[PDB]
Amino acid sequence: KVFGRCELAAAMKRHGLDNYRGYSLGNWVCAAKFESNFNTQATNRNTDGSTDYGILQINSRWWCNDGRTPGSRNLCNIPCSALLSSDITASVNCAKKIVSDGNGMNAWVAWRNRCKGTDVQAWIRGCRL
Ligand code: NA
C-alpha cells in the first residue's frame, strides 16, 4: 500500500504514535516519507546482509525475523513480512519499541539526517486529524 501523507498521519495517530516518546506526528510522517516514500512494501538490503522492511524501514538485525540475518534478534517478535502489510499495526507497535530503546528517533538514520530539527509540522499541515 502507498499511503497518502494525511492518510498515513491519521493511521499513525489512530495507533497512538502521535507524541509517542515525545515525538510529534510530523516527525513520524517525515521519517516514513524518507524511509519508504509511504510504501508499506518498501525493502532495502543493507551491506551487512540485514534487510529493512516497511513504511519505517525496520531492520532485521534487531527487530524482526526474516530467517536470513545471521546472529540477529527479533525483539518485536514478528516475521519481518508483517512489516509489509497494508495494515500499519505491526510497524507502529515495533517502532514504539525502537524509539524507546534509548536514542529516540536517531535509530532512524534518515530521520536524523532529513527530519531532525526541520519544520516537521509541515508534514501534517492541512490534514484533518
Ligand atoms: Na532478525
From Swiss-Prot:
Main location class: secreted
Catalytic activity: Hydrolysis of (1->4)-beta-linkages between N-acetylmuramic acid and N-acetyl-D-glucosamine residues in a peptidoglycan and between N-acetyl-D-glucosamine residues in chitodextrins
Record InterPro entries: Glyco_hydro_22, Glyco_hydro_22_CS, Glyco_hydro_22_lys, Lysozyme-like_dom_sf
GO molecular-function term, one example from the UniProt record: identical protein binding
GO CC entries: cytoplasm; endoplasmic reticulum; extracellular space
Subcellular location: Secreted
Listed Pfam families: Lys
Biological process according to GO: cell wall macromolecule catabolic process; defense response to bacterium; defense response to Gram-negative bacterium; defense response to Gram-positive bacterium; killing of cells of another organism
Protein EC: 3.2.1.17
UniProt binding sites for substrate: D101
Organism superkingdom: Eukaryota
Keywords for the protein's UniProt record, in alphabetical order: Allergen, Antimicrobial, Bacteriolytic enzyme, Disulfide bond, Glycosidase, Hydrolase, Secreted, Signal
Disulfide bonds: C6-C127, C30-C115, C64-C80, C76-C94
Active-site annotation: E35, D52
Occurrences of domain C-type lysozyme (ranges): 1-129
Tissues expressing this chain: In the egg white and polymorphonuclear leukocytes.
Subunit and partners: Monomer.
Function recorded in the entry: Lysozymes have primarily a bacteriolytic function; those in tissues and body fluids are associated with the monocyte-macrophage system and enhance the activity of immunoagents. Has bacteriolytic activity against M.luteus.
Family per similarity comment: Belongs to the glycosyl hydrolase 22 family.
Miscellaneous field: Lysozyme C is capable of both hydrolysis and transglycosylation; it also shows a slight esterase activity. It acts rapidly on both peptide-substituted and unsubstituted peptidoglycan, and slowly on chitin oligosaccharides.
Protein name: Lysozyme C
Gene: LYZ
